[PDB]
Amino acid sequence: EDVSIPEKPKLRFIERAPLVNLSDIRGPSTEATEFTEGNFAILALGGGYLHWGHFEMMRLTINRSMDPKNMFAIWRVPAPFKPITRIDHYVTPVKAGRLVVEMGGRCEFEEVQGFLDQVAHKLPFAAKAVSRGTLEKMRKDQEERERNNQNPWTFERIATANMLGIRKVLSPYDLTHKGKYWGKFYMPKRV
Amino acid sequence: KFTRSRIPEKVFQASPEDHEKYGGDPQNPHKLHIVTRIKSTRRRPYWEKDIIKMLGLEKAHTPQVHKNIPSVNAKLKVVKHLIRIKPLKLPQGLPAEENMSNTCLKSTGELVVQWHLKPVEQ
Amino acid sequence: RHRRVMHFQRQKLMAVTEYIPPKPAIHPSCLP
Amino acid sequence: RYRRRAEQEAQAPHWWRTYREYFGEKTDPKEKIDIGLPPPKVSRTQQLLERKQA
Amino acid sequence: HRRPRFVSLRAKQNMIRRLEIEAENHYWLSM
Amino acid sequence: QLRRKAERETFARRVVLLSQEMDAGLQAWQLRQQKLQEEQRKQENALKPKGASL
RNA sequence: GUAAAUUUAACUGUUAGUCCAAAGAGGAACAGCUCUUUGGACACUAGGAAAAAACCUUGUAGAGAGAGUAAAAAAUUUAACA
């Protein structure tokens, strides 16, 4: 009851074109990594561009499934700005680890997961519905794997020291990525 | 763009655990290096090929002795992935003029000033 | 768009650096 | 006003390279020994009094 | 049309052997 | 065996050469530092201070 | 740490780039595709990867019915009580 729904619960429409770069979809996301006024969200586990077609799909599905009084949804992705020439169409690049959509209100993750997970599978890149507790457990679990890892050899140690001259077969960005990120694809199991 | 690699100085800061593992002594550093090439310079950058030649390591599995000084270590760090570095040990001290013809460098990394080729008693 | 092939040296690096989970000497369920 | 502040800043010592380093004379930091006669003793209160009245 | 190639256990042991030697190289260069 | 004897003696002589060069360089650096300390003491007080100090 | 460098006197030939890794810029975030840059390999050998220009090992100058090594062999079968 404490939570208050905004005057406009359902997701707002997204413009097809702005009113008025492969690196964009590569690597960890530096923005929109933390929940803002919403417990649940869809977490991007890959890097892919989002054209307007996807936005209409997500907005239509989320809005009908969600109940306006019970819950509200806020867009985290900006409008399509990147020009794709085949301008044939406009897209929105999303980096790995970014929350595409956020869901907050009087609801539980199990209630929210259903529609959010369904929309997630449509996204052109791997995405999984997450919650405050789940996402924190996901990050906490990842940190536990690193500290308790028994392997004395790690990608970061080998890459930073250039052991075996590994940097000849590696990208410069791999020093920061540390082997967790291979191009647009992100490997969670990698420590 | 592949380029020369600059390793962070941290990699070359031995920790207390490393000292026990390898048996070094940070208070008394070893004076000379034993350097052998164990990797080919083929398919490696030209600057590594040049460093190998300067150090006298063109022939593989051939022990070379080098001073353990910063300038030499800077060269070794460039080709550290192609070589084996082992401290030279002098259990009997430096070879004297008399011992020059009787020395031998053993696999353990010790330079012995007497090489009888006889069995040790009992 | 599709997972690109890696240089085999890189693939060898990934395999050597794979996470090894700690294994307890005695299984936890087998203890009181 | 800008020039007055600018000259003051230039005189101050800086960690970066400055013209004073390369061209300024290098002299012993220790203060120069004074081997002359002692300064004469002056009563500032009386001196200031007479000067103000003058 | 590259057919996939896989890393054998022997290949991993060979790579680990090189890492151990270079790790020691780091130590001796430290002093 | 003759070739190995020559190669070993060349290796041993290089070992001595490198060791002595490092030792001689170490001693020479020590002397320079000690001289610098002595140079500081050289000009401690050429002339006795005599102005404003009694 | 190394042993090459510049200059002078003469002179000749080669130079229509392929693949791999990396960073960009175009195509379709296609091509064994378009362009540039960094490095590697390929007209110098051999071993390995099934055959194998371009990946890995290794450099190449002979004889031996000796020896130590390098790279070098892919894994995996997916719950339930009422």
Curated annotation (Swiss-Prot), chain A:
The UniProt subunit note reads as follows:
Component of the mitochondrial large ribosomal subunit (mt-LSU). Mature mammalian 55S mitochondrial ribosomes consist of a small (28S) and a large (39S) subunit. The 28S small subunit contains a 12S ribosomal RNA (12S mt-rRNA) and 30 different proteins. The 39S large subunit contains a 16S rRNA (16S mt-rRNA), a copy of mitochondrial valine transfer RNA (mt-tRNA(Val)), which plays an integral structural role, and 52 different proteins.
Q: What is this protein called?
A: Large ribosomal subunit protein uL16m
Keyword Hydrolase recorded: no
Keyword Ribosomal protein belongs to the record = yes
Family the UniProt entry places it in: Belongs to the universal ribosomal protein uL16 family.
Residue window of the full protein shown = 40 to 251 of 251
Q: Which UniProt keywords apply?
A: Mitochondrion, Ribonucleoprotein, Ribosomal protein, Transit peptide
Q: Which GO terms describe its biological process?
A: mitochondrial translation
GO CC, alphabetical: mitochondrial inner membrane; mitochondrial large ribosomal subunit; mitochondrion
| Organism this protein belongs to | Homo sapiens (Human)
GO MF terms on file? Answer: rRNA binding; structural constituent of ribosome
Q: What is its main location?
A: mitochondrion
Subcellular localization is given as:
Mitochondrion
UniProtKB/Swiss-Prot annotation, chain B:
Which GO terms fall under molecular function for this chain's record? structural constituent of ribosome
Q: In terms of one coarse class, where is the protein primarily found? A: mitochondrion
Does the keyword Manganese belong to this entry?
no
Sorted alphabetically, the Gene Ontology BP terms of this entry are: mitochondrial translation
**Which terms are listed as keywords in the entry?**
Mitochondrion, Ribonucleoprotein, Ribosomal protein, Transit peptide
Q: Which GO terms describe its cellular component?
A: mitochondrial inner membrane; mitochondrial large ribosomal subunit; mitochondrion
State where the protein is found. Answer: Mitochondrion
Describe the protein's quaternary organization and the partners it interacts with.
Component of the mitochondrial large ribosomal subunit (mt-LSU). Mature mammalian 55S mitochondrial ribosomes consist of a small (28S) and a large (39S) subunit. The 28S small subunit contains a 12S ribosomal RNA (12S mt-rRNA) and 30 different proteins. The 39S large subunit contains a 16S rRNA (16S mt-rRNA), a copy of mitochondrial valine transfer RNA (mt-tRNA(Val)), which plays an integral structural role, and 52 different proteins.
Q: Which family does it belong to?
A: Belongs to the universal ribosomal protein uL30 family.
Q: What is this protein called?
A: Large ribosomal subunit protein uL30m
Q: Which gene encodes it?
A: MRPL30
Q: Which residues of the full protein are shown?
A: 35 to 156 of 161
Swiss-Prot record, chain D:
Q: Where in the cell is it found?
A: Mitochondrion
At the top level of its lineage, which domain of life is listed?
Eukaryota
Subunit relationships: Component of the mitochondrial large ribosomal subunit (mt-LSU). Mature mammalian 55S mitochondrial ribosomes consist of a small (28S) and a large (39S) subunit. The 28S small subunit contains a 12S ribosomal RNA (12S mt-rRNA) and 30 different proteins. The 39S large subunit contains a 16S rRNA (16S mt-rRNA), a copy of mitochondrial valine transfer RNA (mt-tRNA(Val)), which plays an integral structural role, and 52 different proteins. mL38 is located at the central protuberance.
Instruction: Give the protein family.
Output: Belongs to the phosphatidylethanolamine-binding protein family. Mitochondrion-specific ribosomal protein mL38 subfamily.
| Record protein name field | Large ribosomal subunit protein mL38
Q: What is the lineage of its organism?
A: Eukaryota, Metazoa, Chordata, Craniata, Vertebrata
Tell which residues of the whole protein are contained here: 56 to 109 of 380
From Swiss-Prot, chain E:
Where is this chain's protein located in or outside the cell? Answer: Mitochondrion
What residues form the membrane-spanning segments?
Answer: none
Q: How does it assemble?
A: Component of the mitochondrial large ribosomal subunit (mt-LSU). Mature mammalian 55S mitochondrial ribosomes consist of a small (28S) and a large (39S) subunit. The 28S small subunit contains a 12S ribosomal RNA (12S mt-rRNA) and 30 different proteins. The 39S large subunit contains a 16S rRNA (16S mt-rRNA), a copy of mitochondrial valine transfer RNA (mt-tRNA(Val)), which plays an integral structural role, and 52 different proteins.
Q: Name the protein family.
A: Belongs to the mitochondrion-specific ribosomal protein mL63 family.
Q: What is this protein called?
A: Large ribosomal subunit protein mL63
What is the covered span of the full protein?
Answer: 21 to 51 of 102
